[PDB]
Amino acid sequence: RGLNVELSKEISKRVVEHRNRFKRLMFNRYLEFLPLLINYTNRDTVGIDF
Amino acid sequence: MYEGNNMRSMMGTSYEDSRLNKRTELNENMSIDTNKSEDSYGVQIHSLSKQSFTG
Amino acid sequence: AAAAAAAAAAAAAAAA
Amino acid sequence: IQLESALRQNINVVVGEARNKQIMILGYQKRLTKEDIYFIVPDYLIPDDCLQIHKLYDNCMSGNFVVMQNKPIQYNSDIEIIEHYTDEL
Amino acid sequence: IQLESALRQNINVVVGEARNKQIMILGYQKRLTKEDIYFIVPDYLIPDDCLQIHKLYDNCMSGNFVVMQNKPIQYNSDIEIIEHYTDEL
Amino acid sequence: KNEELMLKRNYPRMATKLYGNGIVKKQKFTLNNNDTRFNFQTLADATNYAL
Amino acid sequence: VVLEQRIASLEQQVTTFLSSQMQQ
Amino acid sequence: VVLEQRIASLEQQVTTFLSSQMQQ
Amino acid sequence: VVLEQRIASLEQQVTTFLSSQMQQ
Amino acid sequence: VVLEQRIASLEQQVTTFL
Amino acid sequence: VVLEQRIASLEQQVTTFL
Amino acid sequence: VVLEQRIASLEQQVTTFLSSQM
Amino acid sequence: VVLEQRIASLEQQVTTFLSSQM
Amino acid sequence: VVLEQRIASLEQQVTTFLSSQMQQ
Amino acid sequence: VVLEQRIASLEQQVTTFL
Amino acid sequence: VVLEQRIASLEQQVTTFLSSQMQQ
Amino acid sequence: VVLEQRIASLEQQVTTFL
Amino acid sequence: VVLEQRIASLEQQVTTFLSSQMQQ
Amino acid sequence: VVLEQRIASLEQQVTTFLSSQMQQ
Amino acid sequence: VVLEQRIASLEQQVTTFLSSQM
Amino acid sequence: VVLEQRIASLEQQVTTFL
Amino acid sequence: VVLEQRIASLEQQVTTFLSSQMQQ
């Protein structure tokens, strides 16, 4: 075992983790969505996985 | 033999088969499709298709 | 993808 | 009323046929249920014959004994949420 | 309901035909899938015949076993975003 | 040899082997919803990770 | 019309009894 | 029609299964 | 009509029970 | 009809079973 | 016919008697 | 409804038979 | 639906055949 | 029709039960 | 014809027997 | 009609299985 | 029809295969 | 029509491929 | 109409079996 | 659609021919 | 005619054979 | 009609390939 916790300004590391995780999440979510906006009269007759 | 109600919720209904699924397989085939060195007396080296394994 | 022939047992006899 | 009271104590009831008229019965990867193995609450109206679950064997064909969940996927009982707000209230 | 629960643990289910009636099965550059190499959850209803993915071989012609993604392009699981706001909440 | 040897019996002899039980073997895994989302900056790759 | 339903009911009755003793 | 052929065929298979292999 | 379908269903059940009683 | 004929064949099978 | 239906229930009762 | 009524009568008749040989 | 029912009957018949020679 | 057959059958079963096994 | 359909299933059963 | 298409599909499958059994 | 003729030719091929 | 010619041609190619080169 | 669909289904069945042993 | 189907059949026939002389 | 179309595909197959 | 245009397109392609094979 190994344990000796910092303080309860652990929150001041939890706060910056929330910021860092929010940037990572919002960035890759926004490009997770962005390649589907158009879809253009979806598969009328045409064999394309749009 | 005895009926009662042989379906109870779980492990009274599990002494039978209980959903045989995804049996262990030789879909990729060792000793025939691979472990193979019966490769024909060809002409040239034409291509070896590289695929990014997404799945 | 083409294969060239293999003369694995061809001991060629000719006449003339 | 007797069904919905049974559903909110989370016991999976099973409605089927008894003499073609849908009496309630109690019902406690996919491994299919067929027989009347489960506990049966009515007295003599039991089917005494081929029961089945009528979900995925076909759409509309198999002999009826369908189980009804209170909630499709169960995570927490809502008798705890009703304890959660009533003290704050 | 059993489909959508399977989709949110991100396992690619595959719906096809079993005896012409669309039972679910599990399904885990373009290299095409054809055969029933994948894991199969039902018992005896397997096609035992020519399966295919019905996406781009034609529009509406090939034998059916189509895979359904939860999300078309996957970057982060939304069980993390639900942990992301629930502590702030 | 004497004639009453017809009365003397001779059983066929046996050669057997017993095997018994096999092994139940198991293997488990433990997938998460928060600590894996600290890594895996795209969600679709986390689903691909899962299967 | 009525037969179409009883014929469907008896085929499921045969199928859920064949699987009770099947090799499947 | 062919529905009568189907109803005749399913009684034949029901008699076959319920008489040959098992009682249930 | 529907009573005829019920009468067909009951004789099938009686034949199944008779095959349940006698071995063939 | 044909359904009546099949019903007559089923009662004949029931009588042969008895 | 309805007489066939009447003959079927008597056969059902005789089978239930056995 | 008529069919259901007929079925009920058949069931009751069977029950009656199952209690007495007469 | 009728076609599907016919297919199911064919499959069951095949299954029955696959268990006994009779 | 068959409804008259049903009304005749139910009086027969009522007479049978109320005369044979019990008085109530 | 429907008799051709009946002859086809008997051939299918005979092939499955082999 | 559609049953005729199903009967055509089943004999094609039986012929394919027979060609799977016997080498020619 | 012509589809019936092709179905008859297919049962002939199935019988020749047996 | 020409659809019958196409259905005759595809059975010929199916018989050719499934009889000549392979079993699958 | 029905044939147009079965003829399309069998051509894909031939094409996805020819590619199993193709030079392609 | 019919024309496309015919074209596909022609292509498959050509492919089949390109593998065996028979 | 359709016979001309049939003669054209046989010529196509014979040309692909060569 | 359109199948006739396809048959005209295929014989033109076969003639072009035959002129590709033999020098004239």
- I-K C-beta contacts closer than 8 Å: 19
SS3 F4: helix
Q: Which of R12, I19, T1 is nearest to S3 (CA)?
A: T1
Task: Spell out where chain D has E strands.
Answer: 13-16, 24-26, 65-68
CA distance H9 to chain G (A): 10
Give residues with Cβ within 8 angstroms of J1, minimum separation 6. none
Q: Which of D61, O10, G2, F16 is nearest to E21 (CA)?
A: D61
Q: Which tokens belong to E12?
A: 């690619």
Question: Do H13 and G17 count as a contact with CB atoms less than 8 A apart?
Answer: no
Contact Q14, P14 (CB under 8 A): yes
CA I6, I11, I16 angle in degrees (round to 5)?
125
Residue with tokens 């059958």: N9
Q: How was this structure determined?
A: cryo-EM
Cα–Cα dist L20/N21, whole Å: 7
Give partners of P (≥3 CB pairs < 8 A): M, O, Q, R, S
CA distance H3 to chain O (A): 11
Give residues with Cβ within 8 angstroms of V2, minimum separation 6. T2, T3
Give partners of O (≥3 CB pairs < 8 A): H, M, P, Q
Residues of H in contact with G20 (CB under 8 A): 22, 24
Distance of CA I1 to the CA centre of its chain: 17
**What strands, in cross-sheet order, belong to the sheet with D13-16?**
D24-26, D13-16, D65-68
CA J6, J7, J9 angle in degrees (round to 5)?
60
**Residue B30 burial (CB count, 10 A):** 9
Q: Which residue of E has its CA nearest to D29?
A: E41
Maximal C-alpha separation, chain F: 96
Cα-atom radius of gyration of chain F, to the nearest Å?
34
Contact T13, R13 (CB under 8 A): yes
CA distance Q16 to chain P (A): 10
Cα–Cα dist H23/I20, whole Å: 6
Cα–Cα dist I6/I12, whole Å: 10
Residue B3 has φ and ψ, to the nearest 5°, of -90, -60
Residues of A in contact with E58 (CB under 8 A): 47
Contact I19, J17 (CB under 8 A): yes
Cα–Cα dist A26/C4, whole Å: 59
Give partners of M (≥3 CB pairs < 8 A): E, G, H, O, P
* CB of S23 less than 8 A from some CB of T: yes
Length of chain T (residues)? 22
Question: Do L7 and I3 count as a contact with CB atoms less than 8 A apart?
Answer: no
In the stretch 3-22 of chain R, residues with CB closer than 8 A to chain Q read: 4, 7-8, 11, 15
Residues of U in contact with V11 (CB under 8 A): 8, 11-12
SS3 M16: helix
Q: Where are the alpha helices (DSSP H) in F1-51?
A: 35-38, 43-50
Contact H12, M9 (CB under 8 A): no
Question: Do P19 and R23 count as a contact with CB atoms less than 8 A apart?
Answer: yes
Residues of Q in contact with R11 (CB under 8 A): 6, 10
Verify Q-U touch: 3 or more CB pairs within 8 A: no
Cα–Cα dist B17/B3, whole Å: 18
Q: Which tokens belong to V16?
A: 């072009």
In the stretch 1-40 of chain B, residues with CB closer than 8 A to chain C read: 40
**Residue M14 burial (CB count, 10 A):** 13
Cα–Cα dist O17/P18, whole Å: 11
Question: Do V3 and T7 count as a contact with CB atoms less than 8 A apart?
Answer: no
Question: Do E43 and B22 count as a contact with CB atoms less than 8 A apart?
Answer: no
CA distance Q6 to chain R (A): 7
**What strands, in cross-sheet order, belong to the sheet with E65-68?**
E24-26, E13-16, E65-68
Q: Which residue of D has its CA nearest to E23?
A: D56
Interface test with M, best of P1, P5, P6, P12 (most M CBs within 10 A): P6
User: DSSP state, D60?
Assistant: S
Q: Which tokens belong to T10?
A: 């022609």
Number of H helices, E strands in chain S: 1, 0
Resolution in Å, one decimal place: 3.8
CA distance A33 to chain F (A): 11
Question: Do R14 and S18 count as a contact with CB atoms less than 8 A apart?
Answer: no
